[PDB]
Amino acid sequence: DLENAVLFEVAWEVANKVGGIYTVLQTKAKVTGDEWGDNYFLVGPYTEQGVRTQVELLEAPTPALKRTLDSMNSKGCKVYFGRWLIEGGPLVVLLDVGASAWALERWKGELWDTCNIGVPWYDREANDAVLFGFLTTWFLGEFLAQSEEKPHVVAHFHEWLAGVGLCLCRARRLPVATIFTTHATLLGRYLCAGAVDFYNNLENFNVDKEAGERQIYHRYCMERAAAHCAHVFTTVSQITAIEAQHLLKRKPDIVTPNGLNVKKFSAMHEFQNLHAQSKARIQEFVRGHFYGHLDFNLDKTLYFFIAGRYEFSNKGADVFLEALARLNYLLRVNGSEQTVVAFFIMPARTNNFNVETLKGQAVRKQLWDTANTVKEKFGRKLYESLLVGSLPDMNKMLDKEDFTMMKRAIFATQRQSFPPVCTHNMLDDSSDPILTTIRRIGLFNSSADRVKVIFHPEFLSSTSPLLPVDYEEFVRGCHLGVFPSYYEPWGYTPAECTVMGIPSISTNLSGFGCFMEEHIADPSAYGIYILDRRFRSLDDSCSQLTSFLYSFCQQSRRQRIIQRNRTERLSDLLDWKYLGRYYMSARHMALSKAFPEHFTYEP
Amino acid sequence: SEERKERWEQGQADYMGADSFDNIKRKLDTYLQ
Numbered sequence: 001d002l003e004n005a006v007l008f009e010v011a012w013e014v015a016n017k018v019g020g021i022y023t024v025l026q027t028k029a030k031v032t033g034d035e036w037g038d039n040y041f042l043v044g045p046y047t048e049q050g051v052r053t054q055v056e057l058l059e060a061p062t063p064a065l066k067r068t069l070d071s072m073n074s075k076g077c078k079v080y081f082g083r084w085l086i087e088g089g090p091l092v093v094l095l096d097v098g099a100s101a102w103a104l105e106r107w108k109g110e111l112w113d114t115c116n117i118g119v120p121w122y123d124r125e126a127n128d129a130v131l132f133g134f135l136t137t138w139f140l141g142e143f144l145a146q147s148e149e150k151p152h153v154v155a156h157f158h159e160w161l162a163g164v165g166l167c168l169c170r171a172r173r174l175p176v177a178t179i180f181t182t183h184a185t186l187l188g189r190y191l192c193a194g195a196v197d198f199y200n201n202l203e204n205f206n207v208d209k210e211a212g213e214r215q216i217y218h219r220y221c222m223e224r225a226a227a228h229c230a231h232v233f234t235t236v237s238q239i240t241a242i243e244a245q246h247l248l249k250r251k252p253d254i255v256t257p258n259g260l261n262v263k264k265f266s267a268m269h270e271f272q273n274l275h276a277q278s279k280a281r282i283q284e285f286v287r288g289h290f291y292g293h294l295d296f297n298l299d300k301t302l303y304f305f306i307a308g309r310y311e312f313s314n315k316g317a318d319v320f321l322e323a324l325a326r327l328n329y330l331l332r333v334n335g336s337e338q339t340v341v342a343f344f345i346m347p348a349r350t351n352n353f354n355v356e357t358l359k360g361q362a363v364r365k366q367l368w369d370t371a372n373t374v375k376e377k378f379g380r381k382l383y384e385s386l387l388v389g390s391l392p393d394m395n396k397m398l399d400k401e402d403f404t405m406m407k408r409a410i411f412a413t414q415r416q417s418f419p420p421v422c423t424h425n426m427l428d429d430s431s432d433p434i435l436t437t438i439r440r441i442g443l444f445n446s447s448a449d450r451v452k453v454i455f456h457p458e459f460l461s462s463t464s465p466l467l468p469v470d471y472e473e474f475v476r477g478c479h480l481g482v483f484p485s486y487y488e489p490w491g492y493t494p495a496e497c498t499v500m501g502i503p504s505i506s507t508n509l510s511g512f513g514c515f516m517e518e519h520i521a522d523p524s525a526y527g528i529y530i531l532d533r534r535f536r537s538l539d540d541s542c543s544q545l546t547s548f549l550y551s552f553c554q555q556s557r558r559q560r561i562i563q564r565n566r567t568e569r570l571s572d573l574l575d576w577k578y579l580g581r582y583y584m585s586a587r588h589m590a591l592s593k594a595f596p597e598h599f600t601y602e603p
Numbered sequence: 604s605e606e607r608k609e610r611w612e613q614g615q616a617d618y619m620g621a622d623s624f625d626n627i628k629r630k631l632d633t634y635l636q
């Protein structure tokens with residue numbers, strides 16, 4: 001349909017930078033910036049901190065818009081109209097959530113005669129969400145009123161924080177089509193750990209009882225009310241669609257997976273050039289976390305990657321830890337030269353680094369300095385040998401002075417303690433779920449161990465004394481990115497991995513893994529290993545993961561490169577250009593249901 | 604009746620009680636989809 005119309009994207013994460021929803025709408029703006037053109041807007045909360053960074057204020061193009069802001073400006077509502085500085089040119093409608101006094105009390109009671117949902121005063125963002133909810137309905141209401149012969153409106157609502165303002169637009173009966181896109185189910189988060197087998201018992205869960213118990217009923221109601229208030233209910237994931245079918249009680253009309261704007265290069269192999277450059281910087285790290293214990297070959301070594309928020313059960317570290325313990329067995333009982341260095345890049349509270357890790361990094365530069373001094377001494381003696389006209393002796397090249405330097409360097413390198421499992425020093429080391437499991441499974445980064453676990457208790461940075469490499473470079477360095485999960489509504493950690501050339505082990509319970517099962521037919525062949533976690537048990541899932549990990553371990557140099565080239569081809573699948581189609585289809589579907597008079601069925 | 608709004612405050616809302624969502628779903632149904 002080509003009809004000229006104005007739509008609004010309503011989210012709390014618009015010009016806030018709080019959650020992952022911000023990152024969704026960051027690159028969504030480009031693809032949605034031509035489908036509806038300049039007519040599309042983004043309704044968001046106003047923060048003075050967010051304005052200095054992201055928002056550049058501008059006047060209204062259309063005279064009807066000028067009055068919508070001015071009429072709203074009267075009556076105590078303040079809008080700072082501006083353009084988002086992010087790529088795409090998104091015109092943002094920042095409503096001040098600070099202006100609580102005019103409508104918080106009156107519209108909260110107005111909310112109760114309409115939706116019959118009450119707001120506790122204790123919960124902070126609860127009172128802030130409803131305010132933002134009425135403010136949206138005001139702007140939409142004025143836009144429909146003051147624009148004579150207003151085209152069919154679409155109100156695109158993201159998260160529970162906007163989910164209240166969904167029902168208000170429907171309650172006024174304002175001519176507006178409505179979309180609710182839940183990026184994560186609210187009650188699903190607490191149900192994931194609190195209730196055993198959440199995915200197995202998704203149908204059984206008493207839907208009102210559980211929310212009341214987690215003192216989160218008011219939030220649950222606002223999101224659930226939003227589903228019955230959108231002609232189109234939308235989930236990011238097909239696994240989240242199953243969640244919503246038995247919890248939110250609304251089947252998602254369309255599943256619109258989140259996407260990334262892939263940073264496409266000039267050479268289609270530049271990712272693999274950035275592989276070797278970043279692998280070397282990881283090689284500088286593991287040639288230093290281990291000094292005097294470097295018996296393993298680092299040219300036959302692999303790097304496994306796992307990242308995200310520090311959630312042991314949700315980000316599925318428990319599955320991956322017991323799997324490396326069995327991968328320890330399979331690469332040791334079998335005569336294998338293959339060593340695997342798994343990196344756990346999950347941020348946690350940490351007072352400072354570890355003396356042994358810092359000493360090892362300093363020793364690595366020391367054995368680089370003592371290998372630069374005698375290298376120059378070799379070089380100078382060679383240059384006066386090449387100039388003289390004689391090839392080097394190769395035995396006298398290094399004097400007794402040089403041999404004593406190198407003999408002492410080796411003597412300082414020697415350590416008896418096994419290289420550390422965690423790079424930094426923790427406040428709660430014994431209470432740490434990852435470190436407790438490591439000492440239990442029996443991987444102390446020993447010489448006998450074919451898998452060495454190197455947890456980095458904080459995010460990677462380029463400005464870091466140890467491991468000076470940023471996250472986007474570090475992913476590209478690692479050979480494989482293993483992401484077992486139980487509650488990843490949309491994998492963003494495994495999603496960004498597949499955007500890069502690195503193959504990622506996703507799961508059936510993850511939003512990314514369900515997407516890869518649906519779109520492409522070939523799982524392991526294209527690179528993305530998918531773990532069955534819905535129809536299996538915790539032990540069974542670990543056993544499948546071992547066979548997946550050992551498959552990558554038994555792979556040759558050349559076969560690894562082919563698979564990494566195949567994973568590059570799947571970047572087009574996660575790009576906003578391809579995955580924006582689904583959102584567009586949601587919009588076209590919304591217009592037709594709410595207003596079939598001039599909108600086609602569009603089957 | 605205005606008692607239920609106060610009950611909502613302080614999270615005294617009843618999941619299966621007066622504040623039960625089933626009533627809310629019918630209330631949304633008054634504004635038919």
Ligand SMILES: O=P(O)(O)OC[C@H]1O[C@H](O)[C@H](O)[C@@H](O)[C@@H]1O
Nearest residue numbers: 272273275276479557558560561
């Ligand atoms: O990552 P591996 O399977 O060990 O292979 C290592 C290879 O990585 C990239 O493809 C580089 O361009 C090559 O120079 C290097 O030989």
